Amino acid sequence: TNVLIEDLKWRGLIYQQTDEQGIEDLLNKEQVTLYCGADPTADSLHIGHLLPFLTLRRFQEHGHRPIVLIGGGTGMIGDPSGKSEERVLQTEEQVDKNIEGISKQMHNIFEFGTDHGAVLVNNRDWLGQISLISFLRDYGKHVGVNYMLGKDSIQSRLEHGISYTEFTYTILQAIDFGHLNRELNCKIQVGGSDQWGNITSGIELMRRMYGQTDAYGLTIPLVTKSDGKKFGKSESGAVWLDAEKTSPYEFYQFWINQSDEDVIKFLKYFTFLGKEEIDRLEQSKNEAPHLREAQKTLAEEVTKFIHGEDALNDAIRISQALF
Amino acid sequence: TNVLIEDLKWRGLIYQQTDEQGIEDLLNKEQVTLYCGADPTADSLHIGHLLPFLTLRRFQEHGHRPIVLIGGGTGMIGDPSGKSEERVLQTEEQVDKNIEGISKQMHNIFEFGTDHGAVLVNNRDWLGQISLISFLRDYGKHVGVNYMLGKDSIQSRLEHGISYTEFTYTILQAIDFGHLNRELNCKIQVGGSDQWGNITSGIELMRRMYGQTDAYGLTIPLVTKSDGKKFGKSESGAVWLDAEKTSPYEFYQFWINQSDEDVIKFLKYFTFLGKEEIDRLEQSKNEAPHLREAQKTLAEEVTKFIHGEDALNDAIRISQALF
Numbered sequence: 001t002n003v004l005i006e007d008l009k010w011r012g013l014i015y016q017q018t019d020e021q022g023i024e025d026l027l028n029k030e031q032v033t034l035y036c037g038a039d040p041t042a043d044s045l046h047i048g049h050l051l052p053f054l055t056l057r058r059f060q061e062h063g064h065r066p067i068v069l070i071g072g073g074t075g076m077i078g079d080p081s082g083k084s085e086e087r088v089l090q091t092e093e094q095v096d097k098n099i100e101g102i103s104k105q106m107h108n109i110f111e112f113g114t115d116h117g118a119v120l121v122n123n124r125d126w127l128g129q130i131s132l133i134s135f136l137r138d139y140g141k142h143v144g145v146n147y148m149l150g151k152d153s154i155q156s157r158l159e160h161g162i163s164y165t166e167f168t169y170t171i172l173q174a175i176d177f178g179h180l181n182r183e184l185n186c187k188i189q190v191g192g193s194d195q196w197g198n199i200t201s202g203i204e205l206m207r208r209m210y211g212q213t214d215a216y217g218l219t220i221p222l223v224t225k226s227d228g229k230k231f232g233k234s235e236s237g238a239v240w241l242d243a244e245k246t247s248p249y250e251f252y253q254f255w256i257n258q259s260d261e262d263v264i265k266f267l268k269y270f271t272f273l274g275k276e277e278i279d280r281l282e283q284s285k286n287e288a289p290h291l292r293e294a295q296k297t298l299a300e301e302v303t304k305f306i307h308g309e310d311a312l313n314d315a316i317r318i319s320q321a322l323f
Numbered sequence: 324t325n326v327l328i329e330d331l332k333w334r335g336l337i338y339q340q341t342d343e344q345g346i347e348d349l350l351n352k353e354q355v356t357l358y359c360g361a362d363p364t365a366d367s368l369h370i371g372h373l374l375p376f377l378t379l380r381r382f383q384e385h386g387h388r389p390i391v392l393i394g395g396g397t398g399m400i401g402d403p404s405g406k407s408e409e410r411v412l413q414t415e416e417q418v419d420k421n422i423e424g425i426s427k428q429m430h431n432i433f434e435f436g437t438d439h440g441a442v443l444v445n446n447r448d449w450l451g452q453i454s455l456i457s458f459l460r461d462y463g464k465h466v467g468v469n470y471m472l473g474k475d476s477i478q479s480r481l482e483h484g485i486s487y488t489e490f491t492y493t494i495l496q497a498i499d500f501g502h503l504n505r506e507l508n509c510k511i512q513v514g515g516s517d518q519w520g521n522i523t524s525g526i527e528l529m530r531r532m533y534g535q536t537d538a539y540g541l542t543i544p545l546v547t548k549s550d551g552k553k554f555g556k557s558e559s560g561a562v563w564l565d566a567e568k569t570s571p572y573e574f575y576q577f578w579i580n581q582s583d584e585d586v587i588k589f590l591k592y593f594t595f596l597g598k599e600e601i602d603r604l605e606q607s608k609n610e611a612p613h614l615r616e617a618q619k620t621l622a623e624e625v626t627k628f629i630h631g632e633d634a635l636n637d638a639i640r641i642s643q644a645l646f
C-alpha cells in the first residue's frame with residue numbers, strides 16, 4: 001500500500017537509508033518497531049531534537065511501534081559525532097538531573113504507559129551491567145578498528161586527538177540497537193544525519209555477532225533555513241522546549257518568523273496537517289503573503305503541541321501587543 | 324511539465340534546496356543556466372566529485388545550460404568547508420599544474436567549445452583582477468560577520484583557530500556566483516552538501532548588493548554505502564578519474580564490488596539508464612543476485628563514460644583473469 005513511505009517522501013523526511021528497497025518492503029509487509037535516542041547533555045531538548053521524534057509519531061500513526069531511548073549510560077560518555085572538540089565528562093548527579101528533565105518532555109510527545117504502544121527506555125539499564133572484561137569478550141571481538149577508523153563521524157576529531165573513550169562511543173550505541181532488536185524486536189533506528197555512523201555500527205555489530213541481517217537505519221535531513229543560517233538558534237541561543245528556558249512566547253515567535261521560502265517545508269516537517277490543507281496554505285502564501293497564514297498556522301500547531309492551548313493563547317496575546 | 328524534477332527526485336539526487344517551489348517554477352518556466360565548481364587541490368578529480376557534475380548533465384539533457392568552474396583563484400586559498408584543519412597554501416605553479424589536469428577531465432565529461440552549450444570558466448580570471456581596497460569597498464561592505472559566524476561550514480574550524488583567510492573563502496565563492504549571474508545569467512548553483520554555506524553566501528551577497536532575488540541553490544546528497552563506510556575510498560586511498568593514478572581495472576573493480584543494498588541507488592545516481600531498464604535490473608537483483616547483473620551494468624556504464632570503450636574491455640579481461 002506504501003501509504004506511509006509516500007507520505008514521508010512527500011514531506012521530504014527521509015535523507016539516508018541503509019537499504020531502500022528492504023525498508024520499503026519491511027514497512028509494507030509488517031508492523032515495525034523502531035527507535036530513536038537522545039543523550040541527556042542538558043536538562044531540556046531543543047527544536048533540533050524535534051524532527052526525528054515527531055517522525056516516529058508519523059510511523060506510529062500507521063501502526064508501527066516507537067521506542068524512545070534516553071542515554072543514561074551513553075550520556076556518561078558523550079557522542080563525538082560531527083563535533084570538533086572533546087566534551088568534558090558530566091557528573092552522575094547532573095546526568096540524573098538531565099534525564100529527569102528530558103524524560104518529562106518525552107511524556108508530552110508520546111503516550112507512554114500503554115500495553116503495546118510507545119516505550120521509554122534508559123540505556124544505563126543494560127550498559128551499566130556490563131563489565132570491562134565481558135564487554136571485550138562479548139562485543140569488542142566483533143568490531144574492526146579499520147571499519148571504525150574509515151568513518152565520517154570521527155575524522156573531525158581524528159585530526160585533533162580523539163580519546164579512546166570518544167572513539168568507543170559508537171560501539172555503545174551499537175550495543176543498544178542489538179539489545180532493543182533482541183528484546184523488543186526493534187528493526188529500524190532513526191536519527192539525524194550526524195548519526196549515520198553510529199546507526200550503521202549497530203547494524204554491522206548485529207551482523208557480525210549473529211549474522212542478523214533484518215535491521216535497517218534511516219536518517220532525517222538536517223533542517224536548513226533558506227538563507228543558510230543555522231536552524232534552531234534564536235536571538236540569544238538555542239530554542240528549548242522547556243518553558244522555563246524559552247518561554248511559549250519566544251517559542252511561538254520563532255515559528256511565526258520563518259521565511260516564505262521555508263514555511264511550507266516546515267509545515268510538512270513539523271505538523272500533522274494533511275496535504276490538502278498544506279497545499280491551500282501554499283496558495284495563500286503565493287497569493288496573499290502579507291497575511292502570513294502559513295506562518296501563523298505553523299506557530300499555532302507546534303506551540304500547542306509543545307506547550308498546550310493555554311500557553312499558546314497567552315503567546316498570541318503578548319505577540320499582538322508587542323507589535 | 325516537471326519531467327526533470329520528477330526524474331531528479333526519483334533518482335534521489337536533490338538534498339537541500341533554498342526555495343523548493345521557486346526552483347520548480349523556474350525549471351518549468353524557462354531554460355536555466357547553472358553552475359558547479361571544483362578547486363584544483365590535486366591534479367585529478369575523484370569519484371566524490373562525480374555526482375554533482377553528472378547531475379549538471381541531466382539538467383543539460385532537458386535544455387538547460389551548465390557552467391563548470393575551475394577554482395584557479397579560490398584554489399590559491401583553500402575551502403575550509405567541513406574540514407577540521409587549516410590547509411597549507413599551494414604554490415602558483417602547483418595550482419597551474421592541477422588546473423591543467425582537472426581541465427582535461429572536464430573536457431571529457433562535457434562538450435565545451437559550442438556556441439551556446441556548456442561553458443568552462445576559471446575564477447582566477449575575475450578574482451585575480453580585484454584589489455584589496457576594491458574588495459572591501461565593493462563586496463565586503465555587504466557581508467555581515469554574525470551572518471558568517473552563525474554558519475555550519477566553519478564551526479568545525481572555529482573551535483580550532485580558523486585563519487582570517489579561510490574565514491573569507493566563503494565570500495570569494497559568493498563573488499563567483501554573483502559574477503556568473505550577471506555575466507551568463509546563471510541562476511542556480513549546485514554542489515555537495517558541504518557547500519551549503521558557500522552557496523547561500525552567494526545568494527545573500529547578491530541580495531544585499533543588488534536586491535537580486537532570482538537565484539537559488541541545490542545540494543546533492545552525500546553518497547553513502549549501506550555499511551556506513553566512506554564512499555569513494557578503495558583498498559589504498561581515493562578512486563581517481565585519472566587513469567595514471569587509478570587504472571581502469573581498479574576503477575571498474577570499485578563499481579563491480581558495490582553491495583546489493585546500494586547498487587540500484589548507484590545506477591540511479593551514476594548512469595543515464597532509464598527507469599524501465601533500472602527496474603528490470605532491480606528485479607534481476609532480487610531474483611538472481613548471483614548473476615550480479617546490476618553491478619556489471621553499473622561498472623560498464625561508468626567505466627566507459629570515464630575511460631572509454633577500449634579501456635573498459637581491457638578491464639573486463641584483467642577482471643576475468645584475476646578471478
Ligand SMILES: C[C@H]1O[C@@H]([C@H](NC(=O)[C@@H](N)Cc2ccc(O)cc2)C(=O)O)[C@H](O)[C@@H](O)[C@H]1O
Pocket residue numbers: 036037038039040041048049050052053069071074079123172173174176177190191192193194195198
Ligand atoms: C534526536 C536527535 O538527537 C541528537 C543527539 N543524539 C545523540 O547524541 C545520540 N548518539 C543519542 C543516542 C544514544 C544511544 C542510542 O542507542 C541511540 C542514540 C542528542 O542531542 O542526544 C542527534 O545529533 C540528532 O541527529 C537527532 O538524532
Ligand SMILES: C[C@H]1O[C@@H]([C@H](NC(=O)[C@@H](N)Cc2ccc(O)cc2)C(=O)O)[C@H](O)[C@@H](O)[C@H]1O
Pocket residue numbers: 359360361362363364371372373375376392394397402446495496497499500513514515516517518521
Ligand atoms: C564537485 C564537488 O566539489 C567538492 C570541492 N568543492 C569546493 O571546494 C568548492 N568550494 C569549489 C568552488 C569554488 C568556487 C566556486 O565559485 C564554486 C565552487 C572540491 O574538491 O573542489 C565539494 O566538496 C563537493 O561537495 C562537490 O561540490
